Amino acid sequence: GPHSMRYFETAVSRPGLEEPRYISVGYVDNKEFVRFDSDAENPRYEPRAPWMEQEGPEYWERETQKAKGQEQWFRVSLRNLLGYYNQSAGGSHTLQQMSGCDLGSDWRLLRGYLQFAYEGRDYIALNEDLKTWTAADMAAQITRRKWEQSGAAEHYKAYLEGECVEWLHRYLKNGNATLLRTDSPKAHVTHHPRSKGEVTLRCWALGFYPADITLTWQLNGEELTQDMELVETRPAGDGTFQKWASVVVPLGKEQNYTCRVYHEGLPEPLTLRWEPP
């Protein structure tokens, strides 16, 4: 399967206090693996996945020291932007960043990734080429020319194809057991009566990991396209997930409809329908 590493950095301006709250969150295959938070008693990078503990105290030190460097980059970036967007205020301002790399199944680099956002909207992004920039608006164009002159793209390129990839290989090597791991969904259909002589059939899918799941309702071989209601895959809180899909179906004709659950943790796809006591 494909692999990814991302660093989701956030800087939230604190009005009055002349240092925002920096939060770097590291993900390997969409799973949080490292985290840095300036709001901590003693701010440092902390292992957010067990396999991350195999690193030495210097890996933590190199990272924590990088974080201190970023915390500063954000302060300034955050100030300059407030400048560009005539916001000179003691109103909180939020600057975010997503940087990382995607790999094929062969662990060969596919894409370099670098996106920035100010106040929830895209500000600037380095293109797939890892050479050119795209600015969202006029103020973002300042950063573009600023960074075209700086040659800043080249360093990010160097990191995304170099450090990012080399590192991701270590992490995948080290986390293999935890990363290849899957919790299968435990499914069931619930009967929810309603008006106009109808019943809603809720196909529940619980305690599954990864969050990628497909829930389908079938009326005797035909896969339902629209009479279906789907909730966004939500975390159980215990590290697993939950999702459900419901269909409004005419009464009695209950067992004409069948739910199918497709998940990679399943020995085979779950086929289930309404079981009345």
Binding site: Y7, S24, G26, V34, Y59, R62, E63, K66, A67, G69, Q70, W73, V76, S77, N80, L81, Y84, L95, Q97, S99, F116, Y123, I124, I142, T143, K146, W147, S150, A152, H155, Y156, Y159, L160, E163, C164, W167
Partner: peptide, 9 residues
């Protein structure tokens, strides 16, 4: 392992 941004915005 994280990166460090160079030039500010």
């Amino acid at each position: 392992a994280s990166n460090e941004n160079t030039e500010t915005m």
